[PDB]
Amino acid sequence: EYRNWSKPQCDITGFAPFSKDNSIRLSAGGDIWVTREPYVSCDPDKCYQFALGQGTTLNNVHSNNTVRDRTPYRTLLMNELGVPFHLGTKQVCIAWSSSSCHDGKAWLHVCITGDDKNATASFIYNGRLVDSVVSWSKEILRTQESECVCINGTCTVVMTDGSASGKADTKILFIEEGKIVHTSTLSGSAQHVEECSCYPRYPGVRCVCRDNWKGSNRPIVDINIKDHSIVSSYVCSGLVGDTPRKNDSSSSSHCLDPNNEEGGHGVKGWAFDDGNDVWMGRTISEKSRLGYETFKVIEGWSNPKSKLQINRQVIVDRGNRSGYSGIFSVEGKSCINRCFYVELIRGRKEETEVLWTSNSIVVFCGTSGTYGTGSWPDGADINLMPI
Numbered sequence: 001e002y003r004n005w006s007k008p009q010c011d012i013t014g015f016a017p018f019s020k021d022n023s024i025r026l027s028a029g030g031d032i033w034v035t036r037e038p039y040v041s042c043d044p045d046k047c048y049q050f051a052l053g054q055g056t057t058l059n060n061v062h063s064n065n066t067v068r069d070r071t072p073y074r075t076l077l078m079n080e081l082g083v084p085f086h087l088g089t090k091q092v093c094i095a096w097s098s099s100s101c102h103d104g105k106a107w108l109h110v111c112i113t114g115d116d117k118n119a120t121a122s123f124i125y126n127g128r129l130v131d132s133v134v135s136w137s138k139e140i141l142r143t144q145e146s147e148c149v150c151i152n153g154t155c156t157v158v159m160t161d162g163s164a165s166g167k168a169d170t171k172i173l174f175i176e177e178g179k180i181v182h183t184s185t186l187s188g189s190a191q192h193v194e195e196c197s198c199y200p201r202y203p204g205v206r207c208v209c210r211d212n213w214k215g216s217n218r219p220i221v222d223i224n225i226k227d228h229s230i231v232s233s234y235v236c237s238g239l240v241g242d243t244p245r246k247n248d249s250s251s252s253s254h255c256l257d258p259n260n261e262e263g264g265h266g267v268k269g270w271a272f273d274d275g276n277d278v279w280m281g282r283t284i285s286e287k288s289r290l291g292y293e294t295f296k297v298i299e300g301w302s303n304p305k306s307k308l309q310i311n312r313q314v315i316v317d318r319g320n321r322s323g324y325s326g327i328f329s330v331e332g333k334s335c336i337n338r339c340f341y342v343e344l345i346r347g348r349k350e351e352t353e354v355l356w357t358s359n360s361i362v363v364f365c366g367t368s369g370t371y372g373t374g375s376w377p378d379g380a381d382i383n384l385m386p387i
């Protein structure tokens, strides 16, 4: 009954529309949670949307100044995918940073809350607290903000503690039925790792992450489930996936080093390999969280000089706000499929018409079929929203 994900990756020609929740538009005529850092994860039957609530609904005095990242009121929300975060939504744990995943039998939730310099991560499995760990470097323990990955009952989750603009202490935790059974330190060539988007790649787990220090190319962390070994590098592709970054004409990348091109800061993102090619998404603006696009870089997984992209799709047009994005994987009859969500951020600080900060989501899944074009932005009229 445990998931093992021992099927080949599906053939992927692109991505087709899967879900959208319209939560900000709904917020203007209904009681909807303020959120950020959303993600998607599916049990063997159905998918769920998650997000970090801000302990308030949008049309509510407490939505003021929800641009703040960490408060004791943030909790992890969980609904079936496509059900918006209404007041019946379950808060599954206290968290201003989270990861969740289903091992085939039950849900694991990794939830981080508490003091910036002395946070706690609770591990909740099958509806009960099984373990916890304290911040090891006293500098904002934080994790993936997207699904973890379980193989044969062993789940893995990437966690970082320490500087956001320098060497930090990243660890890969191995969790069985909610108990931390082993911990490995980040090893290899990735020099800064945050907010990993991880996927099953039998027999292991592979992650594409955020370098917040010197890289606008994304780190890769590869996790061996059996022997707990870790290796790490960077997505080779000369079309890089972080924001900020240089323009397509002047950017470059390395397979084993951060490129040092607009490296500081970043945004959660994702990519995955298909042979020597790489599928990746990124904002369309190279400086800001405007627009979202996907495409395949031919030999982009192994050749750091390639900028040869194909199969581009606009998900969110360049005139509209995007935000975080991350991967999740869905088991099919004969192959493992790859999907992604996009966070559509509205409000402060970039938009000052309102006092709050929140998001909606849109979701696409890989397809072996055909597909057209479009743009699926947030759609809320900020000028007519409650303040």
Ligand SMILES: *[C@@H]1O[C@H](CO)[C@@H](O[C@@H]2O[C@H](CO)[C@@H](O[C@@H]3O[C@H](CO)[C@@H](O)[C@H](O[C@H]4O[C@H](CO)[C@@H](O)[C@H](O)[C@@H]4O[C@H]4O[C@H](CO)[C@@H](O)[C@H](O)[C@@H]4O[C@H]4O[C@H](CO)[C@@H](O)[C@H](O)[C@@H]4O)[C@@H]3O)[C@H](O)[C@H]2NC(C)=O)[C@H](O)[C@H]1NC(C)=O
Pocket: 117, 118, 138
């Ligand atoms: C990160 O988080 C971790 C985990 O939360 C932190 O580690 C924890 O830190 C706790 C605080 O130091 C520690 O609890 C303490 O344990 C010591 C034993 O080593 C114990 O003595 C402490 O209790 C005294 O101090 C607390 C304040 O912290 C008082 O509220 C309490 O009343 C106790 O003070 C009383 O007794 C002392 C006797 O020695 C007197 O000095 C003091 O004046 C006071 O006396 C009054 O009451 C007396 C009766 O007890 C009475 O005789 C007298 O007349 C007075 O009326 C406290 O329990 C945890 O053990 C520790 N946890 C772990 C797992 O290590 C860590 O600090 C955090 N780190 C950062 C960087 O934030």
Ligand SMILES: CC(=O)N[C@H]1[C@H]([C@H](O)[C@H](O)CO)O[C@H](S(=O)(=O)O)C[C@@H]1N
Pocket: 037, 069, 070, 096, 097, 140, 141, 142, 143, 163, 164, 194, 212, 266, 267
């Ligand atoms: C745990 C935590 O506070 N995470 C926040 C990160 C973090 O500050 C950076 O990754 C640097 O460590 O920043 C993002 S962002 O949207 O501001 O880019 C917002 C997130 N809530």
Ligand SMILES: *[C@@H]1O[C@H](CO)[C@@H](O)[C@H](O)[C@H]1NC(C)=O
Pocket: 064, 065, 355
């Ligand atoms: C929102 O918060 C700021 C300070 O955090 C405060 O000065 C301002 O008055 C608040 N606005 C409202 C409408 O309460």
Ligand SMILES: [Ca+2]
Pocket: 210, 211, 212, 213, 214, 215, 216, 242, 243, 244, 262, 263, 264, 265, 266, 267
């Ligand atoms: Ca960066």
Ligand code: NI
Pocket: 254, 257, 258, 259
């Ligand atoms: Ni270099």
